[PDB]
Amino acid sequence: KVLKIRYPDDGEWPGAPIDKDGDGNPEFYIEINLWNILNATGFAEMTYNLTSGVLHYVQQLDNIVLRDRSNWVHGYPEIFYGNKPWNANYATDGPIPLPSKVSNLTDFYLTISYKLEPKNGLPINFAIESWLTREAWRTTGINSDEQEVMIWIYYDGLQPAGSKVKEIVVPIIVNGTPVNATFEVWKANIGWEYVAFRIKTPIKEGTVTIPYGAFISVAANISSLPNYTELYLEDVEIGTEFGTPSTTSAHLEWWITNITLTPLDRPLIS
Ligand SMILES: OC[C@H]1O[C@@H](O[C@H]2[C@H](O)[C@@H](O)[C@H](O[C@@H]3[C@@H](O)[C@H](O[C@H]4[C@H](O)[C@@H](O)[C@H](O)O[C@@H]4CO)O[C@H](CO)[C@H]3O)O[C@@H]2CO)[C@H](O)[C@@H](O)[C@@H]1O
Ligand SMILES: [Ca+2]
Ligand SMILES: [Ca+2]
Secondary structure (H helix, E strand, C coil): EEEEEEECCCCCEEEEEECCCCCCCCCCCEEEECCCCEEEEEEEEEEECCCCCCEEEEEEEEEECCCCHHHHEEEEEEEEEEEECCCCCCCCCCCCCCCCCCCCEEEEEEEEEEEEEEEECCCCEEEEEEEECCCCCCCCCCCCCCCEEEEEEEEEEECCEEEEEEEEEEEECCCEEEEEEEEEEEEEECCCEEEEECCCCHHHEEEEEHHHHHHHHHHHHHHCCCHHHHHCCCCEEEEECCHHHHCEEEEEEEEEEEEEEECCCCCCCC
16 A cells, blocks of 8 residues: 655665556656765655555755766656656556657646655755657667756756756646746757756645646757657656755655646647
8 A cells, every 4th residue: 555665775776666556557657766876874765655645755865975966966756657768667557648759749738736845955846857769668868869858846946957048938727726937948968958947936835737738849949959749758757856066965855646647639749
């Protein structure tokens, strides 16, 4: 009834599938993903109560030494749907067929109910991201003709990579009320093309619905990549990046009670 992963007990890369019907196809996949931490004291723990429906992340890390300061953040504990293209983990038991080529995909809403509690001014975000790859089922990383898209609905003390391009309006739902929100658009070349959308009014808790195609359509429009609509939307990842090169302790807790992807009857890109 309860799934738990823990760093450092489970190794360098704790992770597990959420497979509530035990059918061998996960609905979601969880990872602690401390990808830029070389060593730390303390622990990080992610639990998922299958019975009550709550994901709870608890982190108390100290003595943090990074693998590369130039990566800036320490890690990205997360839950995702689809095929994460950095490893052999995947979750495909859901209504949206990911991976699929962006030219063939439905638009969809993403709704998340959550609460964030970073401690002591820890720099964090709450970021949704997707990777867009040239092959359908990538498991060995990302190339320079591919894209990373993030959507930050909370942040404190972090800025996206690269340069600010523009601001856009995206209609979202916040705590049940539809509302025009503003997103900053940022773009970088970091070994692949990176496009980030950073809300101008961060939301530290509640229920938020976003239209995924509004973001992928702007990412397509501003891209420098050839043949963009041939790329595959591999996954949708939801997690909190945290830390800076100056951060040596990182205590954080969060909860997610619901993630829903709702297909629409319209193309992703418009
Ligand atoms: O699963 C076990 C296998 O793990 C392999 O290592 C993987 C690791 O699982 C995976 O989680 C890691 O992914 C990170 C990716 O989350 C991160 O994304 C960044 C992004 O680059 C950055 O631009 C944006 O700002 O933030 C994102 C979130 O913080 O990117 C880094 C690459 O820079 C990824 O490392 O990828 C690992 C491989 O690099 C082990 O290799 C394997 O042995 C093991 O069996
Ligand atoms: Ca399943
Ligand atoms: Ca994978």
